[PDB]
Amino acid sequence: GAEELFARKFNALFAQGNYSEAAKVAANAPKGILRTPDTIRRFQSVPAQPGQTSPLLQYFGILLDQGQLNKYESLELCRPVLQQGRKQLLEKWLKEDKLECSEELGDLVKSVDPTLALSVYLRANVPNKVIQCFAETGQVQKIVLYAKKVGYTPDWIFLLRNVMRISPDQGQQFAQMLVQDEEPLADITQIVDVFMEYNLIQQCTAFLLDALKNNRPSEGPLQTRLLEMNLMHAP
């Protein structure tokens, strides 16, 4: 019940002109009173300051001496660090399991890197929804495999979503590695739509062709749609 009292002690000693005692109590105290969320957000928020131990360096000290922490503490750890310009720190916390290696941290990276998140889900919690859920670009294989290896084609949706909003572009995509064996998807039209809207038409058709290059993997409709696009795009 003195969570409040601990925060009161920190705020008092910080305010009272002895950052040393406030830091010594806050960092060297149990239950992570510099990673319980208000405390951690304060500690991450203060930027480097001459006169004492750097907040960043003090906090890394704190994290290592303290260690990985719970979903909430790991999550709190993860929520700013990706944003904080230390996305790479958060990649290390997911890879080093300084974070919970949960679905949340992976998803946070998938918002900024599907692939490593996908790596974590492939490695940490072996889920499918989150891992596929973002597949903007990167390691083609996981994407092409989860679309390719039904399931799942919803990973195809997630990637088309992720390629509906993708800074990557024509080139490294996932249909063809996925479909050297023709596969209809949740909507192949989606695939062309995404490609088309990105004018990645060429990759959609190119990849689809390879899918057709396993022959019994061959559907008029893939081809129908392909030809349809070529009729309006370039025959």
Nearest to 118 by CA among 170, 155, 171, 81: 155
Please give the Cα distance from 77 to 41 (Å, whole number): 9
Alpha helices (H) along 28-148: 37-45, 55-66, 71-81, 87-95, 103-112, 114-120, 129-133, 140-148
Q: How far is CA 184 from CA 190, 221, 232, in A?
A: 11, 9, 22
Identify how many contiguous H helices and E strands the chain contains and give both numbers.
15, 0
Q: How was this structure determined?
A: cryo-EM
Give the pair of three-digit tokens for residue 147. 């679309």
Please give the Cα distance from 193 to 86 (Å, whole number): 35
Cα maximum dimension of the chain: 78
What is the stated resolution of the deposited model, in angstroms? 9.2
Please give the Cα distance from 39 to 26 (Å, whole number): 8
Give the pair of three-digit tokens for residue 202. 């060429």
* Contacts (Cβ under 8 Å, ≥6 apart) of 118: 106, 110, 131, 132, 134, 135, 138, 139, 142, 143
Nearest to 147 by CA among 110, 104, 191, 108: 191
Buried residues in 152-172 as b, exposed as e (16+ CB within 10 A): bbbbbbbbbbbbeebeeeeee
Please give the Cα distance from 151 to 156 (Å, whole number): 10
Rg (CA), the chain: 24
User: Which class for 213: exposed (0-12), middle (13-18), buried (19 or more C-beta within 10 A)?
Assistant: middle
